[PDB]
């Protein structure tokens with residue numbers, strides 16, 4: 388389907404949730420949040436994707452870790468907007484749904500900002516990951 | 530139907546291309562481009578909408594007019610996103626298709642920017658118009 392540009396840097400390893408997303412619409416958002424967002428993990432239908440970020444606990448060598456933030460989406464709720472601050476890594480992620488606006492993951496919002504609107508709801512994410520979220524791309528439903 | 534939020538201000542007159550878009554998929558983008566985008570007029574199949582913007586030549590007493598820009602879409606080419614900078618009016622529009630990123634209409638990109646994904650390709654637009662493009666909504670195919 389249609390996707391956004393890649394937002395982020397060249398580090399890490401590529402991931403793409405296209406296949407796991409075929410299990411269903413996003414039902415849950417999980418992130419690890421401190422002054423930056425350190426991982427993202429979505430659930431597609433009943434099927435969690437991988438933890439994309441915070442590859443192992445020794446990543447504390449290079450960044451704060453943060454706390455786990457879970458937002459369960461209700462039936463018929465979908466993400467219509469992503470505000471992402473980023474440079475060589477994703478710094479922060481603020482999601483809005485057709486039902487409500489979620490708190491930003493990442494308290495610092497100092498990097499360049501981009502707002503991506505997804506009519507009909509975000510289908511899935513791809514990007515690059517390691518100790519952090521090197522980059523994100525947003526994929527619509529067709 | 531899947532459609533983006535309305536991007537713009539409350540001035541002008543509402544337009545909606547729903548009916549004229551029954552004439553077919555979008556085959557051409559026509560705009561008027563200066564420091565800002567001053568009208569848009571898409572072609573559906575062989576049939577154009579009315580000109581949405583630059584209502585009359587006295588509009589030069591409020592803003593610059595600009596030059597006609599035409600992008601012909603190849604068959605099977607469809608519009609997949611738009612970067613829109615906007616405030617009281619639409620300032621600039623940068624259309625992207627499944628085949629290429631097109632030139633910006635509107636050299637100034639200084640107001641609020643958003644990247645609208647248009648899942649499945651752009652079906653038609655609606656919005657508000659007058660001397661300028663007061664605002665736009667993008668209607669997606671799926």
Ligand SMILES: OC[C@H]1O[C@H](O[C@H]2O[C@H](CO)[C@@H](O)[C@H](O)[C@H]2O)[C@H](O)[C@@H](O)[C@@H]1O
Pocket residue numbers: 397398399400446449516517518519520521
């Ligand atoms: O622990 C190994 C390395 O961890 C960091 O680098 C990784 O994580 C980054 C953010 O996800 C990626 O950009 C990078 O490509 C990964 O290797 C850290 O920056 C390095 O110093 C460590 O060697």
